[PDB]
Amino acid sequence: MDAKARNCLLQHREALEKDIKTSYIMDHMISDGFLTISEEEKVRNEPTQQQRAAMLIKMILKKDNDSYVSFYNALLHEGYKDLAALLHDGIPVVGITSYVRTVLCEGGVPQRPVVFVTRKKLVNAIQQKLSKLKGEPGWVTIHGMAGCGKSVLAAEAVRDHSLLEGCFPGGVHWVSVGKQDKSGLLMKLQNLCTRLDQDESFSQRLPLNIEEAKDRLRILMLRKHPRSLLILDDVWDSWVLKAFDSQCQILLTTRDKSVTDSVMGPKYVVPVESSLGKEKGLEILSLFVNMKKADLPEQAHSIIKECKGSPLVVSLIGALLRDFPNRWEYYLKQLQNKQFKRIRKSSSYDYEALDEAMSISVEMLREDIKDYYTDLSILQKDVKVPTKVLCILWDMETEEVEDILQEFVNKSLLFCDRNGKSFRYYLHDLQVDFLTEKNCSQLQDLHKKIITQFQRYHQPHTLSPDQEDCMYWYNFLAYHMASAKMHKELCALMFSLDWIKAKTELVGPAHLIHEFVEYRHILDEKDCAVSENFQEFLSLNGHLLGRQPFPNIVQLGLCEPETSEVYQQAKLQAKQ
Numbered sequence: 001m002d003a004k005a006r007n008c009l010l011q012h013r014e015a016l017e018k019d020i021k022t023s024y025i026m027d028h029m030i031s032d033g034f035l036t037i038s039e040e041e042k043v044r045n046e047p048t049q050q051q052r053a054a055m056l057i058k059m060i061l062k063k064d065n066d067s068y069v070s071f072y073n074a075l076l077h078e079g080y081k082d083l084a085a086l087l088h089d090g091i092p093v094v095g096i097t098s099y100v101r102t103v104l105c106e107g108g109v110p111q112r113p114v115v116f117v118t119r120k121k122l123v124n125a126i127q128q129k130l131s132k133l134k135g136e137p138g139w140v141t142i143h144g145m146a147g148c149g150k151s152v153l154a155a156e157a158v159r160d161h162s163l164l165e166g167c168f169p170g171g172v173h174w175v176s177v178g179k180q181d182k183s184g185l186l187m188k189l190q191n192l193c194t195r196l197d198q199d200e201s202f203s204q205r206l207p208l209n210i211e212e213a214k215d216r217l218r219i220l221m222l223r224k225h226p227r228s229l230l231i232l233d234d235v236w237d238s239w240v241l242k243a244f245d246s247q248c249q250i251l252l253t254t255r256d257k258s259v260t261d262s263v264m265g266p267k268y269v270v271p272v273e274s275s276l277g278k279e280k281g282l283e284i285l286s287l288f289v290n291m292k293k294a295d296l297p298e299q300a301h302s303i304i305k306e307c308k309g310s311p312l313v314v315s316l317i318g319a320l321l322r323d324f325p326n327r328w329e330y331y332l333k334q335l336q337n338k339q340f341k342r343i344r345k346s347s348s349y350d351y352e353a354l355d356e357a358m359s360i361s362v363e364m365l366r367e368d369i370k371d372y373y374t375d376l377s378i379l380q381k382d383v384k385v386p387t388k389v390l391c392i393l394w395d396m397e398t399e400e401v402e403d404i405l406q407e408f409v410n411k412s413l414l415f416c417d418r419n420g421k422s423f424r425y426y427l428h429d430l431q432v433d434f435l436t437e438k439n440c441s442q443l444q445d446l447h448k449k450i451i452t453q454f455q456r457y458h459q460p461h462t463l464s465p466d467q468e469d470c471m472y473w474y475n476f477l478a479y480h481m482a483s484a485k486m487h488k489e490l491c492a493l494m495f496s497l498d499w500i501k502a503k504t505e506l507v508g509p510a511h512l513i514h515e516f517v518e519y520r521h522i523l524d525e526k527d528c529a530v531s532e533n534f535q536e537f538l539s540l541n542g543h544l545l546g547r548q549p550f551p552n553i554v555q556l557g558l559c560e561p562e563t564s565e566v567y568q569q570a571k572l573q574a575k576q
């Protein structure tokens with residue numbers, strides 16, 4: 001390579017080694033043809049994250065100008081903005097540019113699926129509607145059935161330099177919404193407000209209710225993110241859309257086109273066909289198995305027919321065929337002879353083919369990871385979970401956890417959004433439904449497992465927002481205990497001035513109040529009454545909690561009726 005390049009590479013090596021995770025970086029470099037499979041295997045055998053990184057950078061140092069740029073592009077693709085900035089210095093000569101790769105990563109837009117086929121006519125129709133917004137507020141709605149590929153479409157539509165530069169110089173921000181209640185949407189809006197004001201030029205505290213969050217979003221889009229697009233993935237209710245109605249440009253996906261009825265301004269719509277066509281389905285298969293479409297066996301056309309146009313199902317089956325290469329007849333027959341049993345029968349969706357594909361794929365998991373996949377049945381819809389949460393669940397180190405999860409990801413059984421060093425894992429809604437149904441009888445014990453494992457790494461009072469899993473536990477500790485039916489632990493957590501103080505000072509009272517209401521049904525008569533004590537203490541004082549300067553929770557508790565357990569706890573602390 002160039003002298004600029006090497007000096008620059010050699011110069012930033014320790015910075016690179018320190019921070020980069022190599023797995024998805026190498027996936028890109030392999031695809032670009034600048035890194036071999038044995039080179040990957042040699043890197044993956046290094047015992048640690050940094051030694052994997054050291055090994056790779058050593059290999060790249062003995063490599064041409066194009067590898068540097070490929071590696072540069074993997075860094076942007078994977079969210080290593082600041083490390084790539086240091087490599088920009090030494091960049092040699094060699095619709096998706098570096099600009100697109102950085103803008104989308106910055107906005108948290110999902111990377112392309114493991115295997116990806118173009119859908120040009122749909123992508124162009126979305127881009128055409130987005131180009132009609134002309135720097136003014138408006139709504140573009142992508143609508144169609146669950147799993148038809150809307151979110152992949154929305155991400156591809158913005159994966160374009162001219163559109164981005166010409167229409168949205170302020171960038172794009174992706175919000176994963178899904179089906180939400182008020183406190184669920186609030187959690188999403190709080191996280192969004194944090195993302196949109198990183199340099200902290202506006203309030204350090206979170207919005208504490210939907211009205212405040214709507215207002216803060218309005219200010220951040222006006223003052224920080226003018227001429228930008230907000231992308232809302234999977235909106236179920238028109239009331240949710242009103243929370244975002246703040247003079248913005250919005251692209252959203254939905255199963256229900258009527259979600260835009262409570263909202264005003266320019267409205268454009270792109271219907272997505274319920275089924276991927278035969279040829280595109282075959283193309284997905286061919287890319288998974290690495291052959292030309294015309295060289296596919298005869299079973300391929302039958303398999304596509306059995307997949308009923310669902311790209312998730314086609315992908316599950318394609319990954320199986322890649323993994324077990326001469327079994328086309330065997331897997332066609334399993335798909336035709338459907339053995340899986342849906343209890344929660346009907347839906348807004350035909351599960352038949354997805355259930356069977358999931359069932360076959362899960363069955364073929366090598367035996368020492370089958371139980372790990374079962375554990376993921378406790379993952380919720382529309383929650384992207386940080387690696388650390390699974391380290392805790394499995395008592396394993398980060399490298400080992402991430403390796404196991406990549407095996408699921410590579411089989412389309414799991415998804416991973418990468419922003420540089422931060423890794424977050426999620427399931428498609430339809431996969432949550434499958435696991436919940438498959439493992440229904442284990443679900444309580446799995447929820448109990450996470451609480452048991454959490455209690456060896458943390459204490460509730462030990463939780464701090466610098467750590468990557470912090471908000472997961474504030475948001476979902478009570479949820480998991482209640483799902484585990486662990487009434488004792490739930491009471492010990494929630495019937496606590498300390499917990500109220502800690503949680504309200506971060507996120508305010510609203511979710512807490514909802515958790516008291518939602519989980520009260522698992523409690524005996526005695527604890528149910530104390531639940532109500534705490535709930536009314538929070539509702540009474542709800543305007544005060546989480547607002548700086550923070551109220552004295554002991555003083556507030558001493559204003560509760562003397563029969564109240566809140567008062568009795570407040571009395572003890574006052575003395576102590």
Ligand SMILES: Nc1ncnc2c1ncn2[C@@H]1O[C@H](COP(=O)(O)OP(=O)(O)O)[C@@H](O)[C@H]1O
Nearest residue numbers: 115116117146147148149150151152311312315
């Ligand atoms: N263009 C595409 N090429 C390859 N796979 C796709 C494509 N679109 C969707 N998929 C597959 O289908 C799954 C579901 O797509 P997604 O966009 O999440 O659907 P929806 O948002 O409509 O529920 C993805 O995780 C991926 O496996």
